């Protein structure tokens, strides 16, 4: 078997498992306590927070632990609404700007708020030419009531990277004018789930006020975190949860020490090795694309992740094989080596996301998402490409 | 060293750790996906759900996994408010009835709703006679706008068990009359965090519509679950989170398979051994109280967890040693064997009518599965020693 669904989830690094397993046995105490077991836990959590900050070029004061990317993403949106309501408690609705290709945990909370008449939202389309939301279109959607721009750093289906530094830069410049006109500053969030561990992620270069971190996309456990620039002092955060004071009351509940241990260790590995991970992923992905074009013919392959001049994740190859019988899911069902997907694991009809990218229906119908990882080898690419060869041959008879 | 703070948290059972580590290595796949590491994951999650159902005498369809007791408790409150808003949009506010001794993850979200003028809340005091919220007072607090009664099944500080079955029964009876007057039915939740694994918890006996489960109170991992009676069909649940369809869209987010594997295994051990666990804790806790009274003298000891007639957890002993110097935190600080807690004196003990002088000397000892009578003897001697040097 060969796994190429790393965008859906990654296995745990053995050092990550070690951190978690040891924490289970040795660090089991309530972190709020002065005994060995609880003091050990507090230390693990403090160290983990430093690691996360280091991974994204931030400070630990700006990181809070969460149950995962879904929570982190929901919390940013929740907080922006609560903040608006608190400013007015002193019927206008807050406005959000986002992209047409966001994860369910950004798109769905925003749809819900529109349905419920709590907020206004602009879903900015991606360019059919660049595959990015144009920064001009984002700036053209601004209203007096706009309070958040949320744009994913990299798309999970295509791998396409969004122009988040430009967005932040242009929003900061706009905000100077807004504040001077009595219009509150617009905050910027990016869902960085798919970028972490695949390319450098640095909050100063990104310029963002919030950033979502998702452990299971970078060989860490199924918990997450949220970066909040100057949490408290510069960026407000209104909690969704109320209880016993943990995470400075931004995210109460007894801390999950083993999960935090794992997340911290997964972050350390990214900090040490990101450049090597990126290099490896790119070599094997590019090699996959070369072998697919040599084996099937350049005329028969649509590279759906390639938009001219647009940066993408090093590990992602979304592509389609031309043929009326070669719908993605049917091709995968005949493969005996390849384990991959046709889109988001959680959506397991063509991908709405690909259609939003302007991929024609005949192509989108045949799309397969292969996403490689740290251990993936060229020999494994060769095995996968032969597997695809036999599967297409099977369906063509 | 001897641990007697199991009400704060438990260590993990060895079996629980193995379920988790096995899932880490072998069941790492996305559960939403189809393939080895991922079918393995979905299998684990399904089996765990059945285990949790079995522990509480319910069905797996009525169980959702959460990140912990705080999320589960907040989710119940949130849902009741949303439901009320949904009903009205086709300035009335929902009303909640709760107790004065709830955990921060029930008390604080309710306080926040009062502060934000989103809901009305009655915090019903506990009687200083029985140490329980009187069911009469709960029913007397009912309003047309009442939508939820939430009363913790056992208190974490004192161990005192609340009359949740009576509460549920009297509310169900009220509801027949309410519905026939065009008044919506009142739902009942119990935070069962402190009862699970210490005494039998059964949703049919309890009569509740919602029930919070907290893994780290019963030798499981730091995640949780929520029971919702006839989830979908009978009891509404409006989610807090939006995302990719997991937990039937009641609680989206990629499932934490290893945590779930551990919670399921912890639940399996409770189902298999709950009675043995109860009997052991009761023996050891009762021996603790005997040995305290023998060593310090009966008149020297206030047993704060003891109200005559009133049921309590088998493992909990909240007590005070009478003495000007013997404030709880100072006594613990001088102990070299006992590891425990005091819970300023506890606001919860004050709410129980414990006089200030006794309250501030209060120590909370809560014993566990492994605690022995020999360990009790060590702890009681350590206490004597500690008291002696604070008395010079
Ligand atoms: C421990 C506990 C909880 C859950 O709190 P978490 O910090 O989220 O584990 C809830 N209620 C009671 C009574 C508890 O003792
Ligand atoms: C995987 C992922 C997430 C995190 O969602 P969870 O299911 O909670 O892990 C968030 N955003 C994107 C773009 C993702 O790919």
mmCIF file with all atom_site columns, C-alpha atoms and ligand atoms in Angstrom, chain A residues 7-9 67-71 73 101-106 152 154-156 191-194 212 214-217 222-223 346 369, chain B residues 30 244 246 251-255, ligand 2:
data_model
loop_
_atom_site.group_PDB
_atom_site.id
_atom_site.type_symbol
_atom_site.label_atom_id
_atom_site.label_alt_id
_atom_site.label_comp_id
_atom_site.label_asym_id
_atom_site.label_entity_id
_atom_site.label_seq_id
_atom_site.pdbx_PDB_ins_code
_atom_site.Cartn_x
_atom_site.Cartn_y
_atom_site.Cartn_z
_atom_site.occupancy
_atom_site.B_iso_or_equiv
_atom_site.pdbx_formal_charge
_atom_site.auth_seq_id
_atom_site.auth_comp_id
_atom_site.auth_asym_id
_atom_site.auth_atom_id
_atom_site.pdbx_PDB_model_num
ATOM   1  C CA . UNK A 1 7   ? -3.847  16.577 3.221  1.00 0.00 ? 7   UNK A CA 1
ATOM   2  C CA . UNK A 1 8   ? -6.672  14.541 4.815  1.00 0.00 ? 8   UNK A CA 1
ATOM   3  C CA . UNK A 1 9   ? -4.540  13.476 7.794  1.00 0.00 ? 9   UNK A CA 1
ATOM   4  C CA . UNK A 1 67  ? -9.624  21.004 20.516 1.00 0.00 ? 67  UNK A CA 1
ATOM   5  C CA . UNK A 1 68  ? -8.766  21.349 16.769 1.00 0.00 ? 68  UNK A CA 1
ATOM   6  C CA . UNK A 1 69  ? -9.019  23.398 13.643 1.00 0.00 ? 69  UNK A CA 1
ATOM   7  C CA . UNK A 1 70  ? -12.818 23.427 13.744 1.00 0.00 ? 70  UNK A CA 1
ATOM   8  C CA . UNK A 1 71  ? -12.891 25.026 17.146 1.00 0.00 ? 71  UNK A CA 1
ATOM   9  C CA . UNK A 1 73  ? -11.882 28.620 13.186 1.00 0.00 ? 73  UNK A CA 1
ATOM   10 C CA . UNK A 1 101 ? -12.972 27.789 -1.427 1.00 0.00 ? 101 UNK A CA 1
ATOM   11 C CA . UNK A 1 102 ? -12.662 27.785 2.407  1.00 0.00 ? 102 UNK A CA 1
ATOM   12 C CA . UNK A 1 103 ? -12.843 24.606 4.549  1.00 0.00 ? 103 UNK A CA 1
ATOM   13 C CA . UNK A 1 104 ? -16.235 23.687 5.966  1.00 0.00 ? 104 UNK A CA 1
ATOM   14 C CA . UNK A 1 105 ? -15.181 25.051 9.370  1.00 0.00 ? 105 UNK A CA 1
ATOM   15 C CA . UNK A 1 106 ? -14.954 28.606 7.927  1.00 0.00 ? 106 UNK A CA 1
ATOM   16 C CA . UNK A 1 152 ? -7.106  30.240 3.995  1.00 0.00 ? 152 UNK A CA 1
ATOM   17 C CA . UNK A 1 154 ? -3.482  27.146 1.359  1.00 0.00 ? 154 UNK A CA 1
ATOM   18 C CA . UNK A 1 155 ? -6.394  25.242 -0.138 1.00 0.00 ? 155 UNK A CA 1
ATOM   19 C CA . UNK A 1 156 ? -6.789  21.613 0.942  1.00 0.00 ? 156 UNK A CA 1
ATOM   20 C CA . UNK A 1 191 ? -6.674  29.150 8.253  1.00 0.00 ? 191 UNK A CA 1
ATOM   21 C CA . UNK A 1 192 ? -3.120  27.839 7.943  1.00 0.00 ? 192 UNK A CA 1
ATOM   22 C CA . UNK A 1 193 ? -4.083  24.173 8.436  1.00 0.00 ? 193 UNK A CA 1
ATOM   23 C CA . UNK A 1 194 ? -2.653  22.966 5.168  1.00 0.00 ? 194 UNK A CA 1
ATOM   24 C CA . UNK A 1 212 ? -5.451  28.524 12.873 1.00 0.00 ? 212 UNK A CA 1
ATOM   25 C CA . UNK A 1 214 ? -4.170  22.021 13.131 1.00 0.00 ? 214 UNK A CA 1
ATOM   26 C CA . UNK A 1 215 ? -2.020  19.251 14.650 1.00 0.00 ? 215 UNK A CA 1
ATOM   27 C CA . UNK A 1 216 ? -3.046  16.349 12.476 1.00 0.00 ? 216 UNK A CA 1
ATOM   28 C CA . UNK A 1 217 ? -1.914  18.014 9.287  1.00 0.00 ? 217 UNK A CA 1
ATOM   29 C CA . UNK A 1 222 ? -5.920  15.774 16.639 1.00 0.00 ? 222 UNK A CA 1
ATOM   30 C CA . UNK A 1 223 ? -5.931  18.969 18.677 1.00 0.00 ? 223 UNK A CA 1
ATOM   31 C CA . UNK A 1 346 ? -15.234 14.845 5.158  1.00 0.00 ? 346 UNK A CA 1
ATOM   32 C CA . UNK A 1 369 ? -6.256  14.430 -5.120 1.00 0.00 ? 369 UNK A CA 1
ATOM   33 C CA . UNK B 2 30  ? -9.165  9.944  8.867  1.00 0.00 ? 30  UNK B CA 1
ATOM   34 C CA . UNK B 2 244 ? -17.396 18.904 8.298  1.00 0.00 ? 244 UNK B CA 1
ATOM   35 C CA . UNK B 2 246 ? -18.716 14.701 12.208 1.00 0.00 ? 246 UNK B CA 1
ATOM   36 C CA . UNK B 2 251 ? -20.113 18.312 16.996 1.00 0.00 ? 251 UNK B CA 1
ATOM   37 C CA . UNK B 2 252 ? -18.053 18.645 13.832 1.00 0.00 ? 252 UNK B CA 1
ATOM   38 C CA . UNK B 2 253 ? -14.282 18.320 13.641 1.00 0.00 ? 253 UNK B CA 1
ATOM   39 C CA . UNK B 2 254 ? -11.998 15.453 12.708 1.00 0.00 ? 254 UNK B CA 1
ATOM   40 C CA . UNK B 2 255 ? -12.466 12.824 15.451 1.00 0.00 ? 255 UNK B CA 1
HETATM 41 C C1 . LIG C 3 .   ? -7.920  19.654 7.966  1.00 0.00 ? 2   LIG C C1 1
HETATM 42 C C2 . LIG C 3 .   ? -8.341  21.168 7.977  1.00 0.00 ? 2   LIG C C2 1
HETATM 43 C C3 . LIG C 3 .   ? -8.865  21.927 9.062  1.00 0.00 ? 2   LIG C C3 1
HETATM 44 C C4 . LIG C 3 .   ? -9.069  21.422 10.472 1.00 0.00 ? 2   LIG C C4 1
HETATM 45 O O1 . LIG C 3 .   ? -10.312 20.798 10.633 1.00 0.00 ? 2   LIG C O1 1
HETATM 46 P P1 . LIG C 3 .   ? -10.448 19.607 11.691 1.00 0.00 ? 2   LIG C P1 1
HETATM 47 O O2 . LIG C 3 .   ? -11.406 18.648 11.001 1.00 0.00 ? 2   LIG C O2 1
HETATM 48 O O3 . LIG C 3 .   ? -11.046 20.213 12.916 1.00 0.00 ? 2   LIG C O3 1
HETATM 49 O O4 . LIG C 3 .   ? -9.079  18.985 11.892 1.00 0.00 ? 2   LIG C O4 1
HETATM 50 C C5 . LIG C 3 .   ? -9.187  23.298 8.932  1.00 0.00 ? 2   LIG C C5 1
HETATM 51 N N1 . LIG C 3 .   ? -9.005  23.919 7.783  1.00 0.00 ? 2   LIG C N1 1
HETATM 52 C C6 . LIG C 3 .   ? -8.525  23.264 6.713  1.00 0.00 ? 2   LIG C C6 1
HETATM 53 C C7 . LIG C 3 .   ? -8.369  24.045 5.427  1.00 0.00 ? 2   LIG C C7 1
HETATM 54 C C8 . LIG C 3 .   ? -8.209  21.888 6.794  1.00 0.00 ? 2   LIG C C8 1
HETATM 55 O O5 . LIG C 3 .   ? -7.718  21.246 5.712  1.00 0.00 ? 2   LIG C O5 1
#
